[PDB]
Every structure is written in C-alpha cells, then in structure tokens.
Amino acid sequence: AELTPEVLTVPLNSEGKTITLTEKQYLEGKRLFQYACASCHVGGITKTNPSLDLRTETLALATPPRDNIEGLVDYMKNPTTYDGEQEIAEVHPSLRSADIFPKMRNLTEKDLVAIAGHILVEPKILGDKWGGGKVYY
Amino acid sequence: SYPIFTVRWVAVHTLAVPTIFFLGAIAAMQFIQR
C-alpha cells in the first residue's frame, strides 16, 4: 500500500468540491499537528475532553460541519463548541487566541490547510485507530 | 617463521568477514525511507 492521491484527496467544503493534497502537504500537516495539537489530540482523541474526537464521522456532525478543509481551517481560527453556540477561543488554541496560545502565532494559512488535511487523511489510513483510543493501540 | 593460515585464521574470518558485510547492509538501511 502507499500514499496515493485517492487517499490524499479530501473534501474542501460542504458543497462537495474536493482537493488532492501532496505527500509534502500531508507530512507538512503531520509535523504541524505534532507541534501544535498532539499534546491533546495524539492519535485523534482529545485527552482533556475524551467525549469529542477527531474521527471524520464526529466532525461531520459538528455544527457547522468540520469534515472538510474549510470547516477545519475556520475552526483553527474561531473554534466553537460542537453545536456551534459558543466561541471557545479563550480555552482552545486558535489564531484568534494566538496571544494566549503562542504556538499558533507562526502558523500561516497554508500551514492551516496542511494541518486540516492531515486530520482528514489520517482516518483513511489508520482506520478505527484514529480517535479510537488505547483499545486500538 | 609463523604460519599464515591456521585453524585460528579460519575461525577469525568465519566471523569477521560477514560481520563487515552485515555492517555495510545495516548501514545502507539507515537511509531507507517509506
């Protein structure tokens, strides 16, 4: 098996347009994800709130949908709760809160796409392990 | 007036020779990427 464009291809938006990442982008996003996100989201879980994960099906049911590049890039700017009703930038890393979350400061806009892409590709590769937890280690 | 090839010669090279070959293969291996 290998890192083919079918796997590197993920939804851009809710409309259904798609985007094909490059290998470089995927590894870029994987690296960036370890830098800014893995301390809480290692393997697609959320250690400070295990009830919410980064599985694609979970992101699909977030309000607004987050199973796509647009929704994830937005979330990294203005993160909300799962039903959309309150902005949680004060307690979640995001560009809007890079003052309090200094790691987010040097994240450019393409960095955000590579992070979002990593998140959407990894479940296609790792399967249930992505966001499944220790049961699947 | 020493012998060159001995039983000793042979046990040494029985080990030393493939050790190096092996070290070369394991060296090449550090540059394999997925």
Binding site: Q34, A38, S39, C40, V42, G43, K47, T48, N49, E90, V91, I100, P102, K103, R105, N106, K134, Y137 | -
Partner: protein, 442 residues
C-alpha cells in the same frame, strides 16, 4: 604504588600538579555551562514553552529574572547569550591555568611558596583553606541577595497576575522562619526545606547563609581544630575527599527532591508542572468540564463512595478526589485562588474559575512529567507522536544517579582512608594477623 586506572591517586602529595587538575576540571565545568547554554539558545524557539524544548540552563537564568517578563514570556534573548559567552570565554582561562599547573608549573607547591603549599596533615593550613572557600561561598550567596534586591529582582511565579519579575524589598530575616524550615519534617505536607514557597524566605535565607559562611570562614582561619575534633577524624587528603563526597551526595538527593516538588525556585512556567501539580490539574480539568455540563461536583458520589471530584483529606481539608488524593499538599499559583480555609471552596469553584485557570490546568495535565527514555511523551502505553520528557524528570533522575554514586564514592574513600591511616589498606600482614591473636569466639 598505583596502577594506571587509579593513576589520579598519584597526585595526592603533588600539590602543584593537583592544583592543575582541579583548575582544568573547573574549566570543563565552565565550558559546559557556557557551551550548553549556547546550544540551548541556538535551539530555543520563544513561542514554545521552555519545557517542550529540553532546556535546563535557560530556565535557571530566567528564574534570576533575566530575559523574561510577566507570565514567563521571553522578552530578550541576549541575557542568555551573554551568560553563555562569558562562561565559555572564562573556561579558556581556567583551562589555561589548569594545563600550565598540571604540565609545566611546579610539581609541588610547598617550596615555591609557604602560602599556597599545603600538607594534608597540617590541620591549621587545611582549616584556613576551608575558611577562604567558606568566605567565597559566603560572598556567592550574597550575590544572589544582591540581584534580588538591587539588580532587577527574581522571577516570581506567585506574583499577582501570572508571575513576573519582582524586586525583593523585605527579605525574611526572622530566624524562627528561616531556621523553622530546617526543623520541619521532610514528610508529606511538611517537606523540610523543599517547601520554601516565597522569594522573601529564599532571599532572607541567603542573607543568613552568606553571613554564616563568612563568619565560619573567619572562624576557621583563626582557629585550629579542638582536641575532640582532632581525635574523631581521619586527617588525610583521601579522608577529606570522602567527607565532601558524602556532602555532595546528600546535596544531590536534596536537589532531586527540590526540582521534583518545588514550583517556586523551579517555576512551572519554565520547568513544566510537577508530578503532583500535573495530577491536580487533571482533576481540575474534568471538574471544570463536567460542571460546565451541569454536574454538581460537590455532591457527586464516585464509584467507591468517596466524592468523584471532591473529598476530604485525612485532616478534613477539601481536596481533589481520585488517586490525586495523595497530592493534596500541592500548592500552585493557578490553584490557590480557589482555596478557602477549609480547603477548596465549593462556591469559588462554582463561580470564580477563570479561563486562564482552565488553560493552565489543561496545559499542565498534558505536560505531566512522564515520558520514555527516547522522549515519547505520556504514559508508557502511549503511542509515538509527542516528543517530550519534562525537565524535572531529566533533573530528578540525573541527580539521583549522581548522588547515589557519590554516596558509594564516600563509602569507598572513607573506608579506604580509615584503613590506609591504620596501615592495612593493602592487606593483612601474614606474620601479625590480628584475628590469630584473638581468642576464638566459641
């Protein structure tokens, strides 16, 4: 007498070559302090907490109040550079003194000068060297007092507002406080001198120790040791090396416990949270999360019948539940706002938790000082991803190992000093075996 592998014991009575060894080794120490810092600074990234970066020396400099402002945010990197360079430069001068005295300078000092030369058994000369070094040590401790009071202060994790650099205007001079630390139990909730939790006590103790050291330094210059001391000790170079090996060993064990428990002179902003702290932060985090969801954390009975979030310590104080019950002695700037006099206050918990406390707890919980030897972060069953081992684990473990081996070194050299002094370190005289002139046991 000595083989190549004990060859440094050839310098015992060669005072000039042995000075060379000491000063050249002092060079190695300054070199590493300088080189390591420059390595750390060259690899430092300010956006990232220091404790995600493998830093052990930059944290020591920040603590002195250089390079940082409120929150521990790094403002200026040049103080770090300066510290590196000057240590690195200085080591060439100590290197130079070292190699000269070891190779070219007089093998023995006592003929070039009756001041620098010494005999190990000259109890007067030895106590005088002691005194000079005590005074030096004394000055050194005041240097820290001076910084704190007259040159910019020290970083204060307890500063109102998230921590900041503060000048200490009222050092604690009361000896009931300073010395009270030295009589507290080393056990939990007491912690002997490891529990010092404010910079006033830190600065005041250094006033005392500087004074005491200067005083004792003068003492030992003017006196020779008294008879009860002359008869209780072995007077030789190896014997004195043994005495200091023991002291270093003890200090090393203390340091281990200091960096593991204390979040005042090792602020968590720089060093990462302590074990206890991280464990408290986890209970805080889910307490926060669950109460936002509607849970009544005060009234929530857990599996065992003990409160799921909140319970009582053995002396009644309200504390975090779960296994962290063992950590209720923890105090930290992010937690104390919640403490009333019965312990954690249910009403402050319901009403007064702030985003910054939430954030700090989430961060410390996910930066607990657990990791693998190859720096995979988290519990030992965790998968690869997070490259991280807390500075506190690196400093705790390294110094336990050294403290231990210096204790072995103490026993090795103390035992040997005794036997060389009594004259049987090389074995039993066959013609006069002590046991053979002793009566049989039975």
């Amino acid at each position: 007498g000595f083989a190549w592998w004990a060859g440094n014991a050839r310098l015992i009575n060669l005072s000039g070559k042995l000075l060379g060894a000491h000063v050249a080794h002092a060079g190695l120490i300054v070199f590493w302090a300088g080189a390591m810092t420059l390595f750390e600074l060259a690899h430092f990234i300010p956006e990232k907490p220091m404790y995600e970066q493998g830093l052990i020396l930059i944290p020591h400099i920040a603590t002195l109040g250089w390079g940082v402002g409120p929150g521990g945010e790094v403002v200026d990197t040049f103080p770090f550079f300066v510290v590196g360079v000057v240590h690195l430069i200085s080591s060439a001068v100590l290197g130079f003194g070292g190699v000269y005295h070891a190779i070219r300078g007089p093998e023995t000092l006592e003929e070039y000068s009756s001041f620098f030369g010494y005999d190990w058994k000259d109890k007067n000369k030895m106590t005088t060297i002691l005194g000079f070094h005590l005074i030096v040590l004394g000055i050194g401790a005041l240097l820290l007092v001076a910084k704190a009071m007259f040159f910019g202060g020290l970083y204060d994790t307890w500063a109102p507002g998230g921590g900041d650099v503060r000048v200490i205007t009222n050092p604690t001079l009361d000896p009931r406080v300073i010395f009270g630390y030295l009589l507290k139990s080393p056990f939990g909730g007491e912690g002997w001198i490891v529990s010092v939790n404010n910079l006033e006590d830190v600065v005041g103790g250094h006033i005392w120790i500087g004074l005491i050291c200067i005083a004792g330094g003068i003492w030992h210059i003017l006196t020779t040791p008294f008879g009860w001391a002359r008869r209780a000790f072995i007077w030789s170079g190896e014997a004195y090396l043994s005495y200091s090996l023991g002291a270093l060993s003890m200090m090393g064990f203390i340091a281990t416990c200091f960096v593991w428990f204390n979040n005042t002179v090792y602020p968590s902003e720089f060093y990462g949270p302590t074990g206890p702290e991280a464990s408290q932060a986890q209970a805080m985090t889910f307490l926060i999360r669950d109460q936002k969801l509607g849970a009544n954390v005060g009234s929530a009975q857990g599996p065992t019948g003990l409160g799921k979030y909140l319970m009582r310590s053995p002396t009644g104080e309200i504390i975090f539940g779960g296994e962290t019950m063992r950590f209720w002695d923890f105090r930290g700037p992010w937690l104390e706002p919640l403490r009333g006099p019965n312990g954690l206050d249910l009403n402050k918990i319901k009403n007064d938790i702030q985003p910054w406390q939430e954030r700090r707890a989430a961060e410390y919980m996910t930066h607990a000082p657990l990791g693998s030897l190859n720096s995979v972060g988290g519990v030992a069953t965790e998968i690869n991803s997070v490259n991280f081992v807390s500075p506190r684990s690196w400093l705790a473990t390294s110094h336990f190992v050294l403290a231990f081996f210096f204790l072995v070194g103490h026993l090795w050299h103390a035992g040997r000093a005794r036997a060389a002094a009594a004259g049987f370190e090389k074995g039993i005289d066959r013609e006069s075996e002590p046991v053979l002139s002793m009566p049989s046991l039975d």
